[PDB]
Amino acid sequence: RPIIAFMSDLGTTDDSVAQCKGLMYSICPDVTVVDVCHSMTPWDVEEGARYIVDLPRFFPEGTVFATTTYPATGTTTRSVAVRIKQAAKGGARGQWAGSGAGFERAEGSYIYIAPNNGLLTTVLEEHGYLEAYEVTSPKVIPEQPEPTFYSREMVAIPSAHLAAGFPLSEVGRPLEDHEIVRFNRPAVEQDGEALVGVVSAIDHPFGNVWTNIHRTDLEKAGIGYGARLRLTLDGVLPFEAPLTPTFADAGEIGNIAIYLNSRGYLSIARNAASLAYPYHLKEGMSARVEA
Amino acid sequence: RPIIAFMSDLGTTDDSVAQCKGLMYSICPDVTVVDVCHSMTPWDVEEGARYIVDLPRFFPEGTVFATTTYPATGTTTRSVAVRIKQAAKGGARGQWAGSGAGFERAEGSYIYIAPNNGLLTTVLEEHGYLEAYEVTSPKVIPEQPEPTFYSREMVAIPSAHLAAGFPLSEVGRPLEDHEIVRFNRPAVEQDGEALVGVVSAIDHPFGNVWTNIHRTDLEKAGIGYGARLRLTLDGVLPFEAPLTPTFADAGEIGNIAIYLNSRGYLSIARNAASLAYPYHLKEGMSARVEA
Amino acid sequence: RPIIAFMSDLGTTDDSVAQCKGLMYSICPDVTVVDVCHSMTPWDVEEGARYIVDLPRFFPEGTVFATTTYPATGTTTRSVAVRIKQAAKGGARGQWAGSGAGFERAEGSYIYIAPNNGLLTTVLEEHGYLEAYEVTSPKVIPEQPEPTFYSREMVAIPSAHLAAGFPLSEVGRPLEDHEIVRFNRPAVEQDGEALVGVVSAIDHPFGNVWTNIHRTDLEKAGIGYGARLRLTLDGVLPFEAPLTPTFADAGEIGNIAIYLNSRGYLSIARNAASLAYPYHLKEGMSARVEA
Amino acid sequence: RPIIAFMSDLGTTDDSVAQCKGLMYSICPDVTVVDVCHSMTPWDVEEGARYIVDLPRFFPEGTVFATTTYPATGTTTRSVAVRIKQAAKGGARGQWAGSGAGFERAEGSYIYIAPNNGLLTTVLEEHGYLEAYEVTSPKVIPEQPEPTFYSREMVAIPSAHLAAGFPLSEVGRPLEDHEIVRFNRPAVEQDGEALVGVVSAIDHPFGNVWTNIHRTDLEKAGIGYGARLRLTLDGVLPFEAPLTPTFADAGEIGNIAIYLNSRGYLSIARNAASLAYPYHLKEGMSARVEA
Amino acid sequence: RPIIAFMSDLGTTDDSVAQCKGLMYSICPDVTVVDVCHSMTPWDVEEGARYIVDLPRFFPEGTVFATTTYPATGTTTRSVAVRIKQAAKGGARGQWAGSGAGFERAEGSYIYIAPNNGLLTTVLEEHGYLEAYEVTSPKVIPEQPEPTFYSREMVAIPSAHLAAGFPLSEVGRPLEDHEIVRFNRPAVEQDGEALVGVVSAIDHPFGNVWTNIHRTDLEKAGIGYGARLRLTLDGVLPFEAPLTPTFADAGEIGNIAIYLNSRGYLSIARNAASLAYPYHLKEGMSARVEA
Amino acid sequence: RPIIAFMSDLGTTDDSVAQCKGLMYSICPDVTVVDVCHSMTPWDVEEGARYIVDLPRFFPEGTVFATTTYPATGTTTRSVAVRIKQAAKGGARGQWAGSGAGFERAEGSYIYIAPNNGLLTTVLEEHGYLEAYEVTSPKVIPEQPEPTFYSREMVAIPSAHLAAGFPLSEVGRPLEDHEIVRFNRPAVEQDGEALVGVVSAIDHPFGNVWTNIHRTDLEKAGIGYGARLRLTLDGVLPFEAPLTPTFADAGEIGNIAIYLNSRGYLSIARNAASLAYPYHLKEGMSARVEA
Numbered sequence A, B, C, D, E, F: 001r002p003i004i005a006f007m008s009d010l011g012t013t014d015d016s017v018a019q020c021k022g023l024m025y026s027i028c029p030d031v032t033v034v035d036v037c038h039s040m041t042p043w044d045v046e047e048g049a050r051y052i053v054d055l056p057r058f059f060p061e062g063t064v065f066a067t068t069t070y071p072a073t074g075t076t077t078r079s080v081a082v083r084i085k086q087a088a089k090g091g092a093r094g095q096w097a098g099s100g101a102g103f104e105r106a107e108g109s110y111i112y113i114a115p116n117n118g119l120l121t122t123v124l125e126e127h128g129y130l131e132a133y134e135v136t137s138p139k140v141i142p143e144q145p146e147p148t149f150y151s152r153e154m155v156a157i158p159s160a161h162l163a164a165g166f167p168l169s170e171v172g173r174p175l176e177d178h179e180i181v182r183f184n185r186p187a188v189e190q191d192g193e194a195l196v197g198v199v200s201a202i203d204h205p206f207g208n209v210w211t212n213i214h215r216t217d218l219e220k221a222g223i224g225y226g227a228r229l230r231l232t233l234d235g236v237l238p239f240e241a242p243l244t245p246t247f248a249d250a251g252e253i254g255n256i257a258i259y260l261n262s263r264g265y266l267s268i269a270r271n272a273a274s275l276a277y278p279y280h281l282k283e284g285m286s287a288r289v290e291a
């Protein structure tokens, strides 16, 4: 019962994803293809990374994650396929996902295949990895790949072979760590007692505001549920509220909530109202907090 | 072959739906997850109810409907899981869906699991129910559920157990009828002999206009499939046309069609052209009809 | 392990697609339903045609393509079901799809079902057909079809019967070629030394510009990779670049690339930036190429 | 105390109008320059014509109207200067303007100067003319005119000489009527019992809708105040109201009024609310009236 | 050297204002017509009032202010003409306007003429008045006024007669105070130590934010230049800064400035950047301050 | 007959300009105020400079130019008032404006008064100056100027005294050249034989595109009035056409015209159609030209 979870920048407005899927079912007849999402900003490797980093612990062991934005499509570049180490514990407090005490995942149970353009930076950072290979074998990719469609040729197709049981180590040569491209992760800074980060994402479709300031960054500063915080955005739009577990703790609908989101990051919203949209708040805006 | 049909307000721009599906496949290996939609206006329980109310007759018996907008996420609230009675009939008459005379559905063949926030209001009304339960057992939800993600913790996860055959009656204690939250549905009022309701929906992607004025309000009002009607929208925009069963009945492409949609409601459209978009017609605009 | 690949104009904002899928699983329990896309401009049969013409080579043999925009829903019209001949080769070079040398697909191995409104024009033109039938039998359509929902009644339902192995030739009577509605598709005009055509699509979500000028058109003007081209859009934008296999060949990010897209068509783009969006280029603008 | 009333397409965002005015004061020191408007759609001679045709009765005799959109700037074309005949009566009733019984204006008492491009079509049609001359003498235009600024060179400058009392007939040679370019203005079609025309303008900033159906058209169909009308816009909006003198007659704020505008034309509006803006009604949509 | 300062909702996109002006020059040949503005939101008497209330002290004594939005155009209503008492001292601290110690204006030196719909509410409140008359005489208004153009018929025209020296008391009968329509002025409230008002206006074209909280309201609370204030808008977007005389006191470009505007009202801006526009701040938003 | 020509960033939506004009008429009873424009992007000293630099030759001698964007309003800064030397010549050659051979202007015939913030940079460059003074005397500015309104206090008021004949040399102390702030103007650079500048302006309302590439840069570059040029905008959008003196030279309506505007700068337009608006071309986009 193999699964491929598929994240691309292909969109859902034409037959691009369906072409990849027909091939995935062709190669791995028993496969289930789960869409992650296909709407990411094209070529934004950092955004793509956020949609894939936390997936492992939610999926059955043995799942393959086919994850791709491929701006270098048609170049001599080749995908990397990696077996991760730990399916972390996560959340706004960390754990295995699921009912009861959650579903514990054995180590080395998930493979990602992606362009080697840094898309997997946070996956490897958070999960570690046991082995990594360049994807080059004509057994798992086209002999004559379509130049403009490497997301199909060098990700979807080889991902189906992996799901179909093709030995990972057979895809191509091992990659040394330095050969795996990484993006730079801007660190959360300290300015006096405040923490300076950025708005990492607008949380669609709610218009919640996510920062890159993490629960661990907060607890490093003696900040926990119930602390009166001031959070400034874009350096000028400021906000004040206690840190609360969830939206409704803000009281009335529309009231500001400052909370930790399901990924453990300091976030800000309105209670059952959109914060970001009325004010055109955006990813990339400076975000500063302080108790 | 167990099915979960999944309707949420989570959107399709991030990994939120994938986290839920991952856990569904973890819990019910042989499951098939069918997306209903994930684009509903967040926290609009009335809109979400429209997308789920007439699902059962289209699905195989035993299908589990996981349906959720959860603005009370992270509070002491718990989901409700119900077995509905009649699978029923829809369109502008009431009947069974499918080829030939349609496929009859045995009573009690479908389970809905949703936040107890009135989302199931119209489902219970149209279908009735045989049993309803609070969803509390750590066999079917997390012992430590993520505060801001009850759509996953309190709907997606438990739905997967139900699809897998976990006894409904064991999810938690039984709920009395009064304990199941309902939303209020505004009635069609009378002014002279005109009926006065609202635009219940813009029917995307076509730009058709759906009213809350039902067949029954028309019938035993005098209006039948050939009546010249005057339909005024937003208190300003008047349209005139015979009541017809379909769009092409309007004749020329672009001509006004006033018809009954499949849910039996008075609707208005242009024939193979968009009515709503050019005039910027919107949900909630008043709608008035007279013969 | 039957597959229905499903392309409609139903959108993804309500339960319309889900109703169709529920019925597909009801009729063909072992079915896999693969979404192609549901976001096409309603009633734009030429656009719908673009999303379906290239599908066959990507899917396992026996796949049924349920493809539909149905502005004549509720009339006496009936759908057409056709068995295609060639699952063609049609990409930038013209090859079978998949790893190695590709998956060669047998002839006569795919069925399309669609309104008989010309939606299948390019499918038949490119692939040919072995047999075609009007879809009328109450064994595969409803005796009392919902007037406004022929995409479900006259496509989704019968596609599931076909996928379950209901004999093609039993859906209804044979259609003569002339009874199969086609739309006209203008040729590329071999103007003097130039090839004259149109922008056929904006390639979402990248903003790439696709023309209807196919590689075969380029051949016979003797135009291949390396050729210094002038591609003039909208009559006033004389873009100049060599024809290259892919985006990165243009060098700097944002630089213009002229290339052959994965459908085999002459296209223009910027390297890892959007061409169409910033300058609001649109489908239907003139496209002229020359070396 | 000479007056130039100045209507151009120059906008109010740069120094173009000021350059013209500086020159007007340089040439005719005692002049008063009255702005008509400068915001017309560039090169839309029919719109420009609407803003100037009704001016004469409002201004003191001897007023010079410098009116210009000049897309043929920098060519061999030269402007036309005309002395009109009747300063007409033309409002909802047809009267002289001002307190008491109005200011009766003598005949032959206003001069227009404009590009000879049809801008003056309705001026001549409504008022008649006594004499017309091509504007060529170096006494009133530059010997070396700025190619891209004929509105200044060939209108503003010569208008100031005219206002300073430079003899009309000395600007250049007499033009034969046929040498005076006119645009065609379609009539209201006396369709059966109805009068068929167009939306001629959206009345900014109120969003009122003006049609080209003049009170004289209404007369002779026997339509006057009190008449219950059906005014159908855009072919599909059958507005119904009595023809009333003014907006408030419609009763409640937002109620539809059908009236005669201050130019004498059949118009439709909402009482102290906007009709055109919310529903995006536009100039050029069909307009049909009938009682 | 009479002056009429003219404020209307007529806009500047057609010949409406020019019609009024031609008549003003016709009636009062020596007049200068100064535009105040013509862009006000139609029928917003409160906004119109803000554009006229502070004008007197800037203008030569004897100036007539013709000020009009006329939603009741064509009804039996008639304008009011009033001679004000004091040309106040104003500003963010109050005074006569001009060089040196300013230009002191004698009492009873200005007349406003306007519809009697409350437009003059704040004029009379701030300036007092010496006498008021209904404008009804056929010596100063048309015998047959155009129904839809009372801003011309009942304001522009009579204003020119006043400028021309027609005795004010001759316009019509005296009006008692209760016959002069007033709008309700929402008071600035106190909530603990805070002051609650509203955003009274977005200050175009800068995007500065003006409140209805006045310098006197502030100094009633012991708040003066240099006080650290918290100002919340829309109940959620908060801001912190000392009260400073001007924008540049904020330091760096873009920094928040809280200041008193030239009309003496508590305002908020960014230093040489727009505050309102990036965040879509709007008039009507709650505004609260507190030291 | 004294004239003030008035250019500001105050807009035309409130009473700001009227307050200034009121004081101008108070101080200089016989003055004529001519609006240049009031719509400039606030605080953009480069844009404001474009609207005032070529004014003098169009105006009668003795005209006072009051020109202001004042983001340093309320600081210790004071305005500068200068008498310019040559009135000069403009267009694409340099000459006098007006009928016949134009009207020559004696040297030293114009005074500008502006904030000392570089607004006059191009004025001084193009015209030279005979004398410059800091504006400080309480004879010409307020003793207590409103902090947020230096455009009125430090420009409008003093300009009116100057127009009235207040001796320039008495407004304050003389300024040395180095004390007059200038802005830096980016030069046209060379790449190969292409000239590389910027779009200096979108020429509203026509949508013409103005570059900072001047006649002189072209001349003594090889480019003359018949040269086939390639003009690339924003580094992407290419246009081709001969250099022509005007729009109609392009031939067909809509055709590309590359020309010199009146200020002598390389510009590009469509003939009697808008270039900028459909392609969303903007100020500041790079512009590159090659023969």
Ligand SMILES: Nc1ncnc2c1ncn2[C@@H]1O[C@H](CCl)[C@@H](O)[C@H]1O
Pocket: A206, A208, A247, A248, A269, A270, A271, A272, A273, B009, B010, B042, B043, B068, B069, B070, B071, B072, B073, B148, B149, B150, B151, B152
């Ligand atoms: N700002 C907000 N206020 C209240 N509820 C919110 C919210 N943002 C997301 N949710 C709710 O959280 C649930 C699980 Cl993610 C989603 O279904 C969504 O309805």
Ligand SMILES: Nc1ncnc2c1ncn2[C@@H]1O[C@H](CCl)[C@@H](O)[C@H]1O
Pocket: B206, B208, B247, B248, B269, B270, B271, B272, B273, C009, C010, C016, C042, C043, C068, C069, C070, C071, C072, C073, C148, C149, C150, C151, C152
């Ligand atoms: N206003 C309209 N005119 C003509 N056809 C329409 C329509 N709205 C929906 N459909 C057509 O109804 C089918 C079943 Cl929902 C869809 O495929 C859509 O094409």
Ligand SMILES: Nc1ncnc2c1ncn2[C@@H]1O[C@H](CCl)[C@@H](O)[C@H]1O
Pocket: A008, A009, A010, A042, A043, A068, A069, A070, A071, A072, A073, A148, A149, A150, A151, A152, C206, C208, C247, C248, C269, C270, C271, C272, C273
């Ligand atoms: N204009 C462009 N420049 C660079 N890369 C591009 C591109 N358009 C699509 N792709 C890349 O092509 C891959 C297969 Cl469609 C997609 O994943 C997308 O990332």
Ligand SMILES: Nc1ncnc2c1ncn2[C@@H]1O[C@H](CCl)[C@@H](O)[C@H]1O
Pocket: D009, D010, D016, D042, D043, D068, D069, D070, D071, D072, D073, D148, D149, D150, D151, D152, F206, F208, F247, F248, F269, F270, F271, F272, F273
């Ligand atoms: N792109 C263009 N094509 C044709 N005519 C144009 C133009 N831009 C400005 N004008 C014309 O130039 C005259 C002097 Cl500025 C204005 O009245 C305007 O009509």
Ligand SMILES: Nc1ncnc2c1ncn2[C@@H]1O[C@H](CCl)[C@@H](O)[C@H]1O
Pocket: D206, D208, D247, D248, D269, D270, D271, D272, D273, E008, E009, E010, E042, E043, E068, E069, E070, E071, E072, E073, E148, E149, E150, E151, E152
């Ligand atoms: N649709 C409408 N309803 C009510 N009043 C209206 C209106 N359109 C214009 N006016 C009013 O008519 C006056 C003369 Cl044009 C203007 O001042 C304007 O206020």
Ligand SMILES: Nc1ncnc2c1ncn2[C@@H]1O[C@H](CCl)[C@@H](O)[C@H]1O
Pocket: E206, E208, E247, E248, E269, E270, E271, E272, E273, F009, F010, F042, F043, F068, F069, F070, F071, F072, F073, F148, F149, F150, F151, F152
């Ligand atoms: N937020 C702001 N920051 C800096 N200066 C500003 C401003 N708003 C208006 N002004 C400046 O104030 C002058 C007098 Cl009203 C105007 O010309 C305008 O340039």
Ligand SMILES: [Cl-]
Pocket: A260, A261, A262, A263, B148, B149
């Ligand atoms: Cl969250």
Ligand SMILES: [Cl-]
Pocket: A280
């Ligand atoms: Cl935006």
Ligand SMILES: [Cl-]
Pocket: A103, B026, B027
């Ligand atoms: Cl598990």
Ligand SMILES: [Cl-]
Pocket: B053, B122, B263
């Ligand atoms: Cl319902």
Ligand SMILES: [Cl-]
Pocket: B074, B075, B076, B077
């Ligand atoms: Cl809880």
Ligand SMILES: [Cl-]
Pocket: A148, C203, C208, C261, C262, C267
């Ligand atoms: Cl492409």
Ligand SMILES: [Cl-]
Pocket: C280
């Ligand atoms: Cl667009």
Ligand SMILES: [Cl-]
Pocket: D203, D208, D261, D262, D267, E148
């Ligand atoms: Cl009107």
Ligand SMILES: [Cl-]
Pocket: D280
């Ligand atoms: Cl629009």
Ligand SMILES: [Cl-]
Pocket: E260, E261, E262, E263, F148, F149
């Ligand atoms: Cl201010």
